[PDB]
Subunit: 328 residues, 4 copies
């Protein structure tokens, strides 16, 4: 998975992610109106939304759970794989605000209007364990969260504490911890976006064979560490050189560079790990844009076209049928 | 630029390319019916098409010139930048079939039905450069040529001779020469598509942080050499692991990985080098598919929907306006 | 700087380091007998050695300070540059065992006989600030420490606490923190010491051009991170494949690979950063071996040839005159 | 293998090599006086030296054969492995000066006084392989040739012709061909010897963790291609930044960086590929300096201390016993 936040030329804030998995999870686009009571049947825990919510997720026994999404106030959240350095509690911890893993994303979007508000409540940070239905393998996720102010945070629970990092890079991938990746960026201070055309190697003239010589040493593989480096510098270069050109499609160009391709990232179970979908949320406008591995045309779902005071959850079918424009 | 040939799960042959430039060249989709006389006004040289032609190009003084394209027989050709090791003749060479740089692509598609037929004629093709209008020369462009048999060749003119290479890799980028890139592939025999989960480092247990550890060492920059390596192995992995899944969208996933992003590949004139468009030709079906930097939705132009015995050149506007599917 | 611990074929333990600096620090080999009172004149703080000490250091106002060294019990310690993530206290902290930076190395060797003994006292870990003479810029260092049991630790003081890590890698370099480097090792689980001779790239046969294809992707620069990776895997390969060949010279072969060469690592003050010397201590034998940038012949100083019950500090001149064997 | 030419601060020319093999070849230092008749007993071919010769080699049936060496005029030659792209003739070619593989090195040094003189004679050197005894062929070895003018050439026989390249890089390794490596150097024009201390990544300050950030992207493995890149740039940096510091030991520092270490470069027969010895010839002085994997102290054999008009071949035992300076 790769997360990304970006500000457009018109001053709008985009937030989204690549979902990188080798399987389907019965996902669909889920809309939840405000003042809507969600009740988990397996453990009888309930949640009533304060704000309307839209994003990608799935439904277990009528209970919604999200992979990423936004609310009507322009707060966004995305849950990304975090397999090694995560540690949830096996049961509730006394005195803490205990949040079940599966419910964290909805908890953020349903209750809060800004990053600053989320930050105070997370101090409170508790990604313990709790199921949802009857079974299911409750995993992990390393959190961020972004809003209309342009500020982003990353949320990671380790064995010692629930960590909340200010994210000044504007990106996230997977393991290891966020502070590891930030220090790793320092290894690449020698990268240059500008062409290096020549090098006088004593008696030998060295001339660049093509464009791109300044970035030689950029890692090309699909590990979380390498993808973090690539997206961080690609984002930086566009802001530095092309702040006034940034729009929706640029978000997709950045994430395409770190997208997984069929065949080349094989798991030990011999399945292909893919970038299954790419989402981009325009936070001010309440529009969830996404495309999929099967269909690259961007699909838009606008929450403002729904009844925010409605009484039903609405779902939209995950689009995996390629849409072509037939010109003649 | 990056060229690619691929065979689908249904046994159809795809051939296409990324066009990587920092400027516009007034390009449009050009269709030319068969038995059509093209006359260059500047030098009075004429060409009558034997086969109907479709592809991307531009028109100078009513004379068409192509960047890539296909013919009705399922022969495809693409012209890619080749700035360093190219050497055209300044005037015609005696006894040779002299082809002007700008006219090479049309010469291939208008006259021949297969790679084998092109191969025999090329034994002799002096790229003596000579304008066709005004004083705007040609390109460093090297040509990849492929057909419905699945076979591809690479054409490169050096100071010594016109080289025609059999292409068993299925890809092409830019400089240096084709034999250089093929030998460079040998440096990467240690790459693995399968996950390496652990490594016992004596008293220390090393465990993979995420998927993709087998491809560590893959170069991530946007130079011609690095892009050649990436596309060669990504193509190999999909054929080896997912031969029966290969379809149209897979072609685009491969080329997306080596696409240039705004801001990060800057020329010495401080302009952003971009992947302006990506074309994919289905050779058996006569369909030219393409998208652009601005609009990622794939557009299809089918030559079989035109009159192949027509008497007019037809053009289609280059689509650079984002096409979104509004779901609700 | 690069630190290294190794066990020989005869079961002896070697511990040493490269010193990588762009300047001289008036270094010499220093021997201190046991029961010897050292008194810092500037701050009147005193230390009486319990064990005899030998190593590289310098003397300020008759007070010895060490860069690396060993004691008569087979305990070794080396102080390596740690510029970014270090944080000493400006004055003594109440209730703690406060150790001045310049005195840490002597404190370890003078007082303790084993890693286990040092570990308990460091819990106690205090690399605060304190001068020595009157001026001088009290720097930082990230600690380890190794003994005759084969076990090593790393000692690093951050803003939060004095960290003591068990070192199962057997190596150390510089910044960032030790836990960062250990996690970074996980990126390289795909490395192979064994030759990969061929790769079937579909229709193209790829054959290795020379030996070493399994390690493609190993970083070649002279940053602390890259040197950590190289030394960790070079050490691992020799233990795995050649445990019974390990002797003195093998230690130097490993460290040579990460040694800095004149001209290629330039500071911002335009000076060349060099591997000024390489030391190797045979802990059971009480012999300090070393060579220098100027003289690669290994020099041996044996503490057992001195009077351990003596009453004088003894010094030996740093050898920077190349020693050649004239055969004829 | 790695070859290197260097000019000292006093204007003297050094020429030498690493020998990288996994076995012993009964090597010794061989001196041959001038006007000495060497006769191969197996094929009755004879050679009378015009100039006295000194270098590393072995003797088969009283016939000497060299791996590297120099003559009394200051001409040097080194034979390096060249396994893939070499092609010797199976028998003599008519009209050519046919040189047996095993005899090439001696042929150069015995007959010629300069690079220019060798160049003219090579216009024609058919490496038709033919034994000189038993059935133990020759090597993939390619030859670097250098003299007191500071000029070097590279000699490579392919299927088409005997190639003689001017060497303006000052280095050589193994396969592929010399022109491949020279073009490969162009990929690394973005390397910098000077420290890059910081990088402003938008809202995030990136600061170098240690020295060496300008060379990130330098390959660290032991393949011929990677070693070529390293030695080329390390040599360049020292000449550019430290021309007036260059002496004998600097030569060894450069070659140490590309030396193979026990355990980490394993062949398919599971043997460790090592840098068995490193030679350095001072061409003006007639001194052959060398050390070995086992003994790093430099040994000097001066041909001017021998009788150049003598009547016997003289040999010196290959030194593989560690020579330590015991200080106390």
């Amino acid at each position: 998975c790769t997360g990304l936040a970006l500000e457009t030329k018109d001053g709008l804030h985009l937030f989204g992610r690549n979902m990188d998995i080798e399987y389907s999870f019965n996902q669909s686009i889920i809309f939840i109106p405000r003042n809507f009571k969600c009740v988990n049947k397996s453990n009888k825990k309930e949640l009533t939304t304060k704000y309307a919510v839209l994003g990608m997720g799935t439904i277990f026994d009528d209970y919604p759970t999200f992979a990423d999404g936004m609310n009507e106030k322009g707060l966004g959240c995305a849950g990304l794989n975090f397999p090694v350095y995560v540690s949830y509690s096996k049961e509730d911890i006394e005195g803490k605000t205990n949040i079940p893993v599966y419910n964290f994303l909805l908890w953020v979007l349903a209750n809060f209007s800004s990053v600053e508000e989320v930050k105070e409540a997370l101090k409170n940070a508790n990604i313990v364990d709790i199921p949802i239905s009857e079974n299911i393998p409750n995993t992990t996720l390393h959190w961020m969260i972004s809003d209309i102010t342009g500020k982003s945070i990353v949320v990671e629970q380790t064995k010692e504490k629930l960590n909340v990092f200010d994210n000044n890079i504007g990106v996230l991938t997977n393991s290891p911890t966020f502070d590891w990746h930030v220090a790793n960026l320092n290894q690449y201070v020698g990268l240059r976006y500008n062409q290096v055309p020549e090098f006088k190697l004593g008696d030998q003239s060295l001339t660049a064979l093509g464009q791109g010589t300044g970035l030689v040493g950029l890692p090309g593989d699909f590990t979380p560490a390498s993808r973090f480096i690539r997206v961080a510098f690609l984002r930086d270069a566009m802001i530095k050189n092309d702040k006034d050109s940034i729009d929706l499609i640029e978000f997709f160009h950045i994430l395409n560079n770190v997208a997984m391709v069929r065949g080349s990232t094989r798991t030990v179970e011999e399945k292909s790990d893919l970038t299954q979908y790419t989402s981009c949320m325009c936070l001010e406008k309440g529009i969830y844009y996404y495309n999929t591995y099967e269909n690259n045309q961007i699909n838009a779902i606008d929450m403002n076209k729904e009844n925010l005071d409605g009484n039903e959850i609405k779902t939209y079918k995950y689009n995996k049928t390629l849409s072509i424009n037939h010109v003649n």
